[PDB]
């Protein structure tokens, strides 16, 4: 009796281990698929960076978001080597909008020495006067947070809805 | 002990009024 | 029952300690008495 129960336990345990490993490989495949989708999105974004016209509007939006977020007298802006002519133009466009929106003036400067890494796909950085407040309004971060927040609809289109999902809430 | 601790802290914060 | 009625204080601690000690003193005395009595009982039974 005791030897038989022991060997039975051994073989059923190793069977359950096999099942768990197989399911883990399935999950590995799912993870590979979704990560490849994220890489596809990233490379598409880098591809569409090249269009100057819409890029100008995007920089306008980013700088005015930074202005609408920092709310101080001392504004600082940092950007890539090959875009600052667009960035300063966006800054002059965005100054009067901020002034009318907040009923207050603001001084702004651009870092002429420190520039973002070339590997950054897009965007700018916003610093206060003392470099103690920062807004990471770069393309990578907004892509990441949007992807995290939108995962449900992504897979709802890809993998479809769950059959067992009975009530939305 | 807790009551004494509370009043001691009250006296301390009153001390740092200025 | 589960306890004796008393308001908590150091006084009752001392008094209960004293009563406790007296209780074990009595327990020792009665135990020794019963032991001697059992010895005598066994002796008379054999005889």
């Amino acid at each position: 009796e005791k030897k038989e129960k022991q060997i039975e336990q051994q073989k059923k345990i190793q069977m359950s281990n096999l099942m768990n490993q197989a399911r883990l490989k399935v999950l590995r495949a799912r993870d590979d698929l979704i990560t490849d989708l994220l890489n596809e999105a990233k490379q598409r974004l880098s591809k569409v960076v090249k269009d100057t016209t819409r890029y100008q509007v995007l920089l306008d939006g980013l700088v005015l978001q930074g202005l609408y977020q920092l709310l101080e007298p001392r504004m600082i802006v940092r950007c890539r080597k090959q875009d600052f002519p667009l960035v300063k133009a966006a800054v002059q466009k965005a100054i009067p909008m901020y002034k009318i929106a907040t009923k207050k003036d603001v001084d702004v400067q651009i870092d002429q020495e420190a520039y973002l890494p070339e590997e950054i796909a897009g965007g700018v950085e916003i610093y206060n006067g003392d470099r103690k407040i920062k807004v990471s309004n770069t393309l990578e971060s907004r892509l990441d947070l949007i992807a995290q927040q939108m995962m449900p609809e992504v897979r709802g289109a890809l993998f479809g809805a769950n059959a067992n999902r009975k009530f939305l809430d | 002990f807790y009551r004494l601790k509370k009043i001691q802290e009250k006296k301390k914060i009153i001390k740092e009024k200025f | 029952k589960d306890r004796i009625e008393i308001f908590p204080s150091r006084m009752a601690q001392t008094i209960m300690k004293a009563r406790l000690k007296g209780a074990q003193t009595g327990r020792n005395l009665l135990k020794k008495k019963s032991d001697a009595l059992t010895l005598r009982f066994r002796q008379i039974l054999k005889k």
Binding site: - | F1, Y2, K5 | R42
Partner: protein, 600 residues
Amino acid sequence: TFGYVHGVSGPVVTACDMAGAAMYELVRVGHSELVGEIIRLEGDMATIQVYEETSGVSVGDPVLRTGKPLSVELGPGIMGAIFDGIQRPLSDISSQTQSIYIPRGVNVSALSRDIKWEFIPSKNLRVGSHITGGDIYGIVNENSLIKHKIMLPPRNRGSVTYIAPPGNYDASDVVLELEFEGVKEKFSMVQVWPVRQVRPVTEKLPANHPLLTGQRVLDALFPCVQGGTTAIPGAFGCGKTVISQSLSKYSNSDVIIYVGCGERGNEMSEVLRDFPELTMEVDGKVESIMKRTALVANTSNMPVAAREASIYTGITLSEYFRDMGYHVSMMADSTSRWAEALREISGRLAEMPADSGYPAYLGARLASFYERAGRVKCLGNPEREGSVSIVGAVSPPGGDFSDPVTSATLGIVQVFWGLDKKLAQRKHFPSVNWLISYSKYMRALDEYYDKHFTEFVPLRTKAKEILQEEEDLAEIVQLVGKASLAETDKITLEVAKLIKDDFLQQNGYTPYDRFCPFYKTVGMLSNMISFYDMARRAVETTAQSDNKITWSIIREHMGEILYKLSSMKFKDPVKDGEAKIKADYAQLLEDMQNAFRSLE
């Protein structure tokens, strides 16, 4: 760095003019370099805790910045030395100053850096190969009994670029230059590791091997598994050296570490004298246990945090040696003193007395402390394995198991070894109660016994139930008058007397009883229980119909056998061949069944 030193509410002092720093970061104070660390921080100024008399400390005095929290330094030469709570080489201090007092704020590394060692590289790693943490790259012959393997620390990896050849390298020398991604680093044979955490391990495996003990008692009755956790009581005079010495000399463990706080120098001088005396002759020669053990002790003069942290330091050292692929045993002496030290620290920091004055988190800290044990296997190339066992001493107030600390220690531990002063004055060595002491490791070792001996468990269960039967019938046989009882009760009482006077005794100073091996123990057990079995079997057979056997007839018929049973301990396994001893058991058993058959 100009500490704006304030006064004190004791030793604790605060100061200002401090740059970026983190809590629990070591700091020196004044030109006398009094040791401390950060407690609280705020704005630009931080409060700190010093551990020495703050007299003579003026305002505005310098404070030396460091770059590590409370940490221990480890490497070759640690084995065999003596330390304190904050890892200070008091031997080297007496060597440096030749004084009889502690110099305040000693700036002496625990490891003398002017000592040369003979290093041999791995011979397997090549230039340009990639290695990670935990991987051996060399060795050093620290001592002739234990080979000190050297491996990379965790959280470090990269492609080697230079290998120092074999030779004669001091403590400050460099042996590895590892290029990580885009950066380079320097690596010597000493390494720095903070204390309030556990170095990660690849996996934990279940304990599957008994902890060998020289004493046959506590092994064949209430075993402790290698890598387990144990609790021993501690009382003035009940006897604690009896287990410590036996564990240090007679034990399958590879290294010994003894810690403690609030002890004397008497045990220190005792182990000094035990360096030659308690030597193990693995090679037939006297090698000192100093080579196989490291000592650390603290008096009550030492700072409260030193006492607090020495217990953690013991686990840190045991971790460092279990990473090497070895087996460790810990003597965590005076745990109640550690609890009192923690209570003092909380009183210093003005916390609430959660229970009996002790802080709130005592039990949680104890559980975390006892989490560090068991058999494991760590990061590396050869996939070694090791284990760590703990033996924490507990000093209840007069034996009352009601104060919180003893209750927690009883709750977490599995196997408890009991001691007694009644048995101590009964000239019984070692003292064990047999009724409060328990174990919980029988389940783990079942396969080991089934594979190796195959008769240990049934005989052990028969032994313990016989002892329990004696304990039960003691009251009845007292009440009746010790003159009326069934024959089976008589034989149970008699075999209890024999297993008392014979199997549950041992004299360390006696040359032949210095070590009792496991096979000797199980042989005695099997012989005695088989004798009892045949005895009460024959008694039950003859009690009913006729030829009713009584113990007087059994004694007069088997007196020679009783004498042989009493005297069979005199074997001296060191000289007498083991096979001869087993043959002696065989012929003794032969005599047993011959006498039992001739009785009928």
